[PDB]
């Protein structure tokens, strides 16, 4: 709602409070100079003030080159207000199907959570590695046998642009 | 298999498209800060000349002036930045090629995975590739182990290698690729006795002098 | 930017989208400096292609690992000395201004840390250059002792009194780091300069920057459009520029924080993984071996090391 007490103008949530306003005090202030909660007048009660729920919107998509589907993350609002929907710590995703299986992880979204896979787009907790156990023992070493020679590349940047502006 | 590799998966080469990318984004919106008024009647200074008298030409330009200044120093301050981060990578390129291509790398991971053999620079737009050429153990067998030899009461340590069993006998092999080694006094060494060590197992060690004299 | 800058006035967004791209360039900065915080860390954690688990069985040649294995019983599987850091770090939102959670939680960090740890544990540095071959730990050890210019056997005659010392400068660390305050200051710090950022970003809202009232809504409902127009552009140009020093020191300090996940990553590569012969790189002393913990925005090392003690004069000759 829209409020407006005693002058104080803002957009907020109204809600009930356990805050003891002393009764010289008409409205209180959070940490960092911002209205936290403030007296109503005419019934003489505390009420809290929390902001109306607000957030950036993503979108997760496989690229042009394979779908034109979609998947968008209400990252901090609850989406129980204005096909699938999955409530995750980092938000609720919606377009995005939750497979109870893990893989490893292709769009990051957040808090563990990953998400295209059999023709549509997955929402997954993404997978370490595989699972294993090394047989530990008080009298038991592995010893290679046979070496591979292996080629790997790493690219590192050395330079930029020499850009001169006048 | 790196040609076809680097030839057919994409973003390969991101590291150094990234950091094109970068400098042709912030460049590109110093030029698009052009168009925009910050509060003037044009973004054009030339029409505003062409239409306002200096005494309040001026006021409009000075305005200008502070947009595009502000927006100048936003974009040196930002290429600062990632200079100095361009700049550490070229720092940790040279050292790599010191300590990877003139040299043979001995701290771990740094010269790629596995125990780094030797490396191979290339040249890239704007940066360096390195193939780096490792020696991955593999396929691994198990074997029982004792850290030493009793051996007439003596306690027998290899010199280098472990001893290792294949069920029924013993043997010395390098930890780094199986290469089972009959034990003698040459392979091995003496130190203390065998009532000390909490892991040890009853074998014999041949002394090719045993051999020689027979 | 938008929300912060101006919020909910249209008199208002109309002046502030005449300056063009800041508002994309900040974000831009913004989602870059997130972006590499989780790629600090996957570098600094993520080192093994595979979760390894140590046995059931803790027959590790008298060394006593509990106190740095995860504790099973643990509503988290943390281990004691990471159980103690997340308790010792101590850790606002509601201009526009929102924080994203990181990609790794603090169990799968927890989870790359056991795993490097299991690794470490069972099977030396074999697991880092290629696949994990188990070793005995007293073996390992041994090994760790030759690669230093002391002879295998040196451990295994006094491997009681070895596995004895490991074990008192493992408890000891608990109770250091549960007395000593300001032990975790590195971390302490990082938290409270961004918390302080925030907090200084969010009061610079109350400023007036000439303006003749600090809140958008009462000037533009008191003073009229042709000249309220003037303070709110004023008030505007004041509050971004707050911004664009808050993202400046953001970069600055985004490179900090990365110089030193850098860091952290070579010595998880070459102390954990590996052993070290760079001198103080992996403690004072000779190193031997390196356990990570996690820790709330960083890693924690503990650096096993060898120092010579008592010593004696001798004459020489070459
Ligand atoms: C302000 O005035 C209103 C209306 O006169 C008061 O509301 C009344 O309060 C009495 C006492 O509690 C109740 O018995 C009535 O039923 C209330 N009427 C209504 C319509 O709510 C209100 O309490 C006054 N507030 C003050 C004096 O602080
Ligand atoms: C070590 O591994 C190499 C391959 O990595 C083996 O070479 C293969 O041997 C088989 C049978 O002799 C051939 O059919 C393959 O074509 C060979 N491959 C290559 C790339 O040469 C080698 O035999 C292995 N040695 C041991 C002792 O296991
Ligand atoms: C968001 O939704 C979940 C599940 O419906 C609920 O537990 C939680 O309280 C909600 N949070 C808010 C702020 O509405
Ligand atoms: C060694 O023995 C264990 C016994 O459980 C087995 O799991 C493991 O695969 C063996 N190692 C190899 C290389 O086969
Ligand atoms: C172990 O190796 C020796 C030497 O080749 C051989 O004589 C013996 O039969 C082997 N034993 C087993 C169980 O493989
Ligand atoms: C190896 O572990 C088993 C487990 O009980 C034990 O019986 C045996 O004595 C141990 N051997 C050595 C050499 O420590
Ligand atoms: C090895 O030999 C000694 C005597 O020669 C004996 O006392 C000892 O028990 C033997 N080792 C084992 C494991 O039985
Ligand atoms: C290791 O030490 C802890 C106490 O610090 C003890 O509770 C635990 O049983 C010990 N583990 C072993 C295997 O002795």
Excluded at chain 1, 99 to 112: L, Q, T
Excluded at chain 3, 48 to 69: A, C, E, H
Excluded at chain 3, 255 to 281: H, P, W, Y
Aim: with cysteine.
């Amino acid at each position: 709602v829209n409020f407006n007490f005693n002058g104080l103008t803002g957009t907020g949530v109204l809600t009930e409070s356990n805050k003891k306003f002393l009764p010289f005090q008409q409205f209180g202030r959070d940490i960092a100079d911002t209205t936290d909660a403030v007296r109503d007048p005419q019934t003489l009660e505390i009420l809290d003030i929390t902001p109306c729920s607000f957030g950036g919107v993503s979108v997760i998509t496989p690229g042009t080159n394979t779908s034109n589907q979609v998947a968008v993350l209400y990252q901090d609002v609850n989406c129980t207000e204005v096909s699938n929907v999955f409530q995750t710590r980092a938000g609720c995703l919606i377009g995005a199907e939750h497979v109870n299986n893990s893989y490893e992880c292709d769009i990051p979204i957040g808090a563990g959570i990953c998400a295209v896979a059999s023709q549509s787009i997955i929402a997954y907790t993404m997978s370490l590695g595989a699972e294993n156990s090394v047989a530990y023992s008080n009298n038991s070493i592995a010893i290679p046998t046979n070496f591979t020679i292996s080629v790997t590349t790493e690219i590192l940047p050395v330079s930029m642009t020499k850009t001169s502006v006048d | 298999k790196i040609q076809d590799s680097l030839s057919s998966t994409p973003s390969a080469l991101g590291k150094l498209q990234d950091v094109v990318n970068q400098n042709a984004q912030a460049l590109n919106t110093l030029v698009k800060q052009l168009s925009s008024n910050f509060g003037a009647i044009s973004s054009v200074l030339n029409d505003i000349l062409s239409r306002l008298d200096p005494p309040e030409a001026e006021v409009q330009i000075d305005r200008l002036i502070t947009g595009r200044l502000q927006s100048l120093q936003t974009y040196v301050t930002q290429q600062l930045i990632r200079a100095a981060e361009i700049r550490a990578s070229a720092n940790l390129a040279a050292t790599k090629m010191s300590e990877c291509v003139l040299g043979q790398s001995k701290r771990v991971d740094f010269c790629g995975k596995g125990y780094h053999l030797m490396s191979f620079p290339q040249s890239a737009p704007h940066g360096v590739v390195f193939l780096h050429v490792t020696y991955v153990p593999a396929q691994e067998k198990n074997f029982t182990t004792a850290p030493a030899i009793c051996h007439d009461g003596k306690a027998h340590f290899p010199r280098e290698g472990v001893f290792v069993s294949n069920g029924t006998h013993w043997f010395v092999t390098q930890r780094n690729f199986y290469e089972p080694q009959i034990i003698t006094t040459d392979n091995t060494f003496v130190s203390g006795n065998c009532d000390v060590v909490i892991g040890i197992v009853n074998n014999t060690v041949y002394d090719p002098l045993q051999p020689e004299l027979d | 930017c938008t929300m912060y800058i101006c919020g909910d006035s249209t008199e208002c967004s109309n002046l502030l989208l005449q300056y063009g791209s800041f508002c994309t360039q900040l974000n831009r900065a913004l989602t870059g400096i997130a972006v590499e915080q989780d790629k600090n860390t996957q570098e600094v954690f993520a080192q093994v292609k595979q979760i390894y688990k140590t046995p059931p069985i803790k027959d590790f040649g008298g060394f006593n690992f509990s106190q740095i294995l995860p504790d099973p019983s643990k509503p988290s599987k943390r281990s004691p000395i990471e159980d103690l850091l997340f308790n010792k770090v101590t850790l606002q939102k509601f201009n526009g201004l929102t924080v994203l959670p990181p990609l790794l939680t603090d169990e799968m960090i927890a989870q790359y840390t056991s795993a490097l740890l299991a690794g470490t544990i069972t099977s030396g540095w074999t697991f880092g250059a290629g696949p994990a071959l188990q070793i005995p730990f007293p073996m390992q050890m041994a090994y760790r002792f030759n690669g230093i210019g002391v002879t295998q056997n040196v451990l295994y005659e006094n491997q009681k009194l070895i596995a004895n010392q490991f074990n008192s400068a493992i408890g000891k660390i608990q109770d250091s780091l549960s007395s000593t305050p300001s032990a975790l200051g590195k971390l302490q710090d990082v938290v409270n300069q961004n918390a302080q950022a925030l907090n200084t970003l969010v009061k610079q809202l109350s400023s007036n920057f000439g303006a003749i009232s600090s809140v958008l809504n009462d000037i533009l409902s008191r003073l009229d459009p042709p000249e309220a127009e003037v303070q709110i552009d004023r008030l505007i140009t004041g509050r971004l520029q707050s911004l664009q020093t808050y993202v400046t020191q953001q970069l600055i300090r985004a490179a900090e924080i990365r110089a030193s996940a850098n860091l952290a990553a070579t010595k998880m590569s070459e102390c954990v993984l590996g052993q070290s012969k760079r001198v103080d790189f992996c403690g004072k002393g000779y190193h031997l071996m390196s356990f990570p913990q996690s820790a709330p925005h960083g890693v924690v090392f503990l650096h096993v090391t060898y120092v010579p003690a008592q010593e004696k004069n001798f004459t020489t000759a070459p």
